[PDB]
Amino acid sequence: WTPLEPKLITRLADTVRTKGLRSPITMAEVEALMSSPLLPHDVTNLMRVILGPAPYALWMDAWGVQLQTVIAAATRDPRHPANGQGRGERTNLNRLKGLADGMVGNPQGQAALLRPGELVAITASALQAFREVARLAEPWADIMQGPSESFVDFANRLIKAVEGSDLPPSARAPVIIDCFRQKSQPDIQQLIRTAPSTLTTPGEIIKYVLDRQKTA
Amino acid sequence: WTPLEPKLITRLADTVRTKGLRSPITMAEVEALMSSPLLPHDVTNLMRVILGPAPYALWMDAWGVQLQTVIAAATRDPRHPANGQGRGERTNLNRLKGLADGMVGNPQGQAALLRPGELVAITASALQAFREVARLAEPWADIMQGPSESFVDFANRLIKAVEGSDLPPSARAPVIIDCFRQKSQPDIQQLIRTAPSTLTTPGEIIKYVLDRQKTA
Amino acid sequence: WTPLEPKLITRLADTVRTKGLRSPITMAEVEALMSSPLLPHDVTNLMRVILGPAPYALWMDAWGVQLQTVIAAATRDPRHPANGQGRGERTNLNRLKGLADGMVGNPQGQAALLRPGELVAITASALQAFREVARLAEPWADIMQGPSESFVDFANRLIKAVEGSDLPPSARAPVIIDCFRQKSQPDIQQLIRTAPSTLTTPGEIIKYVLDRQKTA
Amino acid sequence: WTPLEPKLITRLADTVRTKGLRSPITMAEVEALMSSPLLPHDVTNLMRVILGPAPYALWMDAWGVQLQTVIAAATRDPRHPANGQGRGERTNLNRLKGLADGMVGNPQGQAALLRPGELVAITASALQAFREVARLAEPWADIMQGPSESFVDFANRLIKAVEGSDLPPSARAPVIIDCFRQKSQPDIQQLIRTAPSTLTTPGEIIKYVLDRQKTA
Amino acid sequence: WTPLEPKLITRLADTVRTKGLRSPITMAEVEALMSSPLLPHDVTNLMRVILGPAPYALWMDAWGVQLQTVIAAATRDPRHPANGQGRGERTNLNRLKGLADGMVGNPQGQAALLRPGELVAITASALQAFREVARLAEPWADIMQGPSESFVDFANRLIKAVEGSDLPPSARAPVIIDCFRQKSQPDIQQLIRTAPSTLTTPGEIIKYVLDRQKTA
Amino acid sequence: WTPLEPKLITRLADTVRTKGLRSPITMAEVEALMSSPLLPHDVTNLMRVILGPAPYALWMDAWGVQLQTVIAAATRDPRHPANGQGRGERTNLNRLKGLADGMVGNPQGQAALLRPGELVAITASALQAFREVARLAEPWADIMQGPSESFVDFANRLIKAVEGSDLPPSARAPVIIDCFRQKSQPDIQQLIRTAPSTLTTPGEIIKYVLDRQKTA
């Protein structure tokens, strides 16, 4: 086990302190420090340092919930990269949260007994939990394209607010499309309306509008 | 599998944030971080971090299209460095996009089953897709030299707009020359017209005009 | 013997100077510079540089007390990794504090005669002493949510004061919950009281209150 | 022999230029760059660069005096880590100051003939000389605890001024205690007076006061 | 082949952006990044990134002209470090500009087939071309030594303006001498006039004046 | 042949630009970058980059003179580490300045044919030439302590002007002492005169005066 640099952690903590939890630069920095698969000890201490007390409590809750969803999917499929073929390799939440025997407080033993699939699952779970808490701590139907705003900025803002909301995953694309059509001030509205082809995806709509947009 | 440094990724993300997607320094930095053959996981997370939501959607589209062209060329030639000799090594798009069995979400298994030819093909495809999206996201025949503008500023603006346009590479120099001759208000027009030597390159025209220009 | 970098020591000293002795980032940095087993000379000079005069006196006291507890456990078990099997390898406090013969002021001789078990015991003792002094140097039942204060600030302040106090670790969550319920002015008190679900964690209470709070 | 980085030396010189010679950050930085045992050449050039001309003269004087005290202790004990067992290894001041044969101006030969005990003795002597000159270049009985000042700051200031003064080493602890008792405004005066135990050490007094102090 | 760091290239580009092309600090930085022999790909991309469009066109022109002079000298001497002994190693401009077979667009193959003499000749040619373009993008006979200016600054400015001008190489030293004698306000004029020795070189004049100058 | 880092060269150039040629930190940095034996190409380009035009001319002159002295000593002793035993290894100035056959402009061939003794002799010659030019490019007996000036400032100024002058090294301390005694306005003059001890060192005089000075 090799610890993360306290210099990088200090820089990330100051980034979270000045920019906040939800800025795209902060999420990019977290993705950067979330590159190599981390042990539960690493992620736990990282969130202890970069997050305040109340966001840290929220993040512990969300991380537990996401890990429980992962363990449900694992008991729903014996071919999980964290699982094994026999029943003796089934992964309990004590092993994921670092609470199992031979792991409590010891990162070396942790790194010894853990699987790489276990590590990547823990890491993805922690990233999703961080996203949830960031969206929770500090409205997509109120988003309009400003008179002077470009279209890529409007699309970025709208997709961000729609994907970071309470909608089901299967309802985001139709909502994004129908918001492109009704928001996005009447020049682009008419540009999308008079589309000789049928656009059935936000990416296709974005490409079409970027091609035929009024250069100004 | 070894992940890319989040420090390099953060620096590249800030480069894309300040300079944009199309600057030659940004493309050089991307080529730098595109040096070793990356696994689909690496490139996917890299584009997730450095690109905004809408450019990321566009890039996913373009990457899929380029990979499909690659797979068409692969079924058109059984000697692809990603293919094998027998039919059992034919490479499906699920294996290229990282969607095949034993690869979904697991970078270690990905690195296990993938071929080096597969990796370099994926990498070249991703680079071409990035170029397409950069050219797509953010008029040379409307550029005139202002009455008060200097000539080097006009030349910079014109060369920028001509090279960052939809012209073929072999048509930029003649267009730049003929735009120097017809734009560039009539004092410099007559200065270029009465050139005892024949100027056959934008650099030579710029040098001549800078030598014989009316100091004012 | 190889000395620690004065650059790392200077950075750690400035960290202690700005963040204080008790911040989790400071303890993480100390754990980082406490990774390899240090000789008494190293830890002594490190604490001389990073700590002020009075905290250094306190730390010398605490380190002596912890080393004495270690030596009592060592005379209570002849199988200490610092001890040997015969009586001639029993470790005296002069050998632990670096005061024994051939060690006073000489780090090379120190590194020569010392055991790895001796080094790790000295290191753990010094870490525990640092924790004690940090807890000692610089009231949770008096914390109320102000009439104009938001709830996340109140939760941050309360969790800080409860975790940085003299309570056992197993008594912090119930106290934080019961302080959320009785402090946190009667609007939020009634909001928590009328919870159709049972909230059994500070994170869950924080999430619920943030969801259903009166936007104002 | 490997030279110290001129970048670190430049940073240390600017630190000495802005903060002064006596600041605790400056002494910490000097301790940092005084980590590995330096050859007389290294310390001499370091003090030549970081110190002005007059402080450098003072430091040469003080270094000579401290080295002479070291050589007196060495002739008073044939078991010095710089000495040897026979009389042929006795260390002369020409060998300590780098003036001996085969060493004058040559750092490689210096590093060849010098002992590690010689190096650490030279280094400790130079550090003590730096402390003396810093205390000399730019009053403990005039120190009072301000009405708003905390007790650890007052203790730090008092111990600093008492240890960096002209008192004998055997008279510092009683003076520090009796200054804690008579300074340290009457609340802490009465707190120390009504001590059911007898406090016979500055560390014990500091611990007691920090325990029973009026939180405010 | 190893690429240059995009961090160094970004710093150099910002240096060129703020200080300009002709500042001595910029030329020093270019000399720094021109230390190891670069392949045509490296220098071409470097000038593409650090220079604007019009200076880049000018630089391509000047680089071609200087490489043509080099190839003329090469056909004038079969002992060029880029040439070989037989006629089959004669170096064509397609091989120098990176246009030869097996080199177009491929830096690895470039580094494979190129000679070290080829690399150093290309590098020196590119440096001279950069100097020409910098002197061209933004008068010696108008330079006077100011009443308060020192003599070394005046000599630096004069030698810079004379060597970066349109004079033949064999006419710079006499002009520099005769400008030292007639400029360089009458105190130094009389100091040079009453020289018991005959000064026949700018360096000798500078040395003499620096020796006998009026300290003030 | 491996080139020096342009980053180190840029840092050294900025050091020379801010601190000057004669500062002890600058000479230390030059000694640092003069550690490994450099080829004539390396030293020539280094001095071209870090020095201005006129100091570079002066340095070329001084380097030639010092190399000529070296070659005179070499013809005065056939056992020079640059020479050989037979007459066919005698080293000409064309081989030292890098002007010999197979070396002009080619650092690789240079490194091939040159001897290590040749390299170290060239390096020492270049260092001595740099020292000469630095002493030449930029009065102690006119220094008085101003009526309002402190004594440490006067001592700094005097020691600076005496050590940076044309006196032999063995004549600086007596001159500094006798200038302390006769300058340093009559209050300090009488303070030094009535010294019950004999002060035989500038540091001792400075310490005595700082102790017994009239606080004002």
Author numbering:
A (entry chain E), B (entry chain F), C (entry chain D), D (entry chain C), E (entry chain A), F (entry chain B): 11 to 148, 152 to 229
Could you give the paper's own sentences about this structure?
As the virus buds from the cell, the viral protease cleaves Gag into several fragments, including the capsid protein (CA) that then assembles into the mature capsid shell (core), rendering the virus particle infectious. The CA portion of all retroviral Gag proteins folds into two separate domains, the N-terminal domain (CANTD) and C-terminal domain (CACTD). In mature lattices, CANTD interactions form only intra-hexamer and intra-pentamer interfaces, while CACTD interactions are also involved in formation of inter-hexamer and inter-pentamer interfaces. Our results show that, like lentiviruses, RSV is sensitive to IP6 in vitro and in cells, where in the mature CA lattice IP6 binds in a pore formed in the center of the CANTD hexamer.
